Amino acid sequence: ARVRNLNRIIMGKYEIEPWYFSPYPIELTDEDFIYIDDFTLQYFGSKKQYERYRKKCTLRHPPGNEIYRDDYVSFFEIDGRKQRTWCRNLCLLSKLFLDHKTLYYDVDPFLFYCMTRRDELGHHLVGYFSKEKESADGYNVACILTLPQYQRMGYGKLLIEFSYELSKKENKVGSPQKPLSDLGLLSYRAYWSDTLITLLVEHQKEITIDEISSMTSMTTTDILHTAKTLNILRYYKGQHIIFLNEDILDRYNRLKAKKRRTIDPNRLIWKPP
Numbered sequence: 001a002r003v004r005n006l007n008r009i010i011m012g013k014y015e016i017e018p019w020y021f022s023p024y025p026i027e028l029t030d031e032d033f034i035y036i037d038d039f040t041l042q043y044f045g046s047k048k049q050y051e052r053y054r055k056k057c058t059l060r061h062p063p064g065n066e067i068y069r070d071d072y073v074s075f076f077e078i079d080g081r082k083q084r085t086w087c088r089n090l091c092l093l094s095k096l097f098l099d100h101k102t103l104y105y106d107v108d109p110f111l112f113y114c115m116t117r118r119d120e121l122g123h124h125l126v127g128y129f130s131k132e133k134e135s136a137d138g139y140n141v142a143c144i145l146t147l148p149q150y151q152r153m154g155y156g157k158l159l160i161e162f163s164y165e166l167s168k169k170e171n172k173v174g175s176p177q178k179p180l181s182d183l184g185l186l187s188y189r190a191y192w193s194d195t196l197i198t199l200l201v202e203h204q205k206e207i208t209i210d211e212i213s214s215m216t217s218m219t220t221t222d223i224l225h226t227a228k229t230l231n232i233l234r235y236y237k238g239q240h241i242i243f244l245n246e247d248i249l250d251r252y253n254r255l256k257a258k259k260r261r262t263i264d265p266n267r268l269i270w271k272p273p
């Protein structure tokens, strides 16, 4: 009698192996897989069951308001309390790739911003980031995740950039919840670096900390840490600034050479509560 662990999830054409254990309320059997509907995120122990529900009539995108939509991606804002089932399913899926995550069942305190890529086939959920409706620490992100099958395609940086656009619209600085996984922290460091580098080349050769946080919603701490890492911190005109140098120009051009997609602030149709 085999009592197997969940060793693989079948999502669309993808067969993904979890990185960590997730509390799916499922029976342990001699099989080690479950089906995850790429639209509803519902889990099924049998292909037949999955098929049975797949036929049902359902929207083909996350259950929320589309507050951002460009030719590349869309962002849906979902209130956990309004979509408990879907969000709980999202959290169970997310935990498979997180060392730790708050109780998956309690989604009420969060707002989920799910990003989809649109094809000739429609919407495809590629990642998301949750956010406390009320954060005592002012965290502008709780967990952020790019589904495994879509990682290392630039989606994570888009998720992060979007979280800062919300903060900017809110007229507040923000920073991701600590502690961050290594993957998460390294992604933020790259984003913060790319951001200061782009500002120095496209905005001004010299910029004060205040100006930076005002334009990016990045906190003083994240700005200083990033500036020190790049060796671009100085004192000019009576205050601390970051400055441009050949290294930064080089980095900027290399960044641009990758012709990466970015978020257009003008397409964010959203008002904070």
Ligand SMILES: CC(=O)SCCNC(=O)CCNC(=O)[C@H](O)C(C)(C)COP(=O)(O)OP(=O)(O)OC[C@H]1O[C@@H](n2cnc3c(N)ncnc32)[C@H](O)[C@@H]1OP(=O)(O)O
Binding pocket: 097, 098, 141, 142, 143, 144, 145, 146, 147, 150, 151, 152, 153, 154, 155, 156, 157, 158, 176, 177, 179, 180, 181, 182, 183, 184, 185, 186, 187, 190
């Ligand atoms: C806040 C918190 O509670 S934190 C927890 C953070 N989340 C996790 O740990 C969950 C598991 N991990 C993940 O979901 C992901 O690893 C994340 C979100 C941390 C990062 O997401 P990703 O989609 O992989 O990010 P992204 O692709 O933008 O990262 C850039 C990397 O992709 C590579 N890349 C992007 N597009 C391309 C492309 N077209 N061709 C080749 N490489 C590419 C970059 O070269 C870079 O590699 P590098 O980091 O060694 O320099």
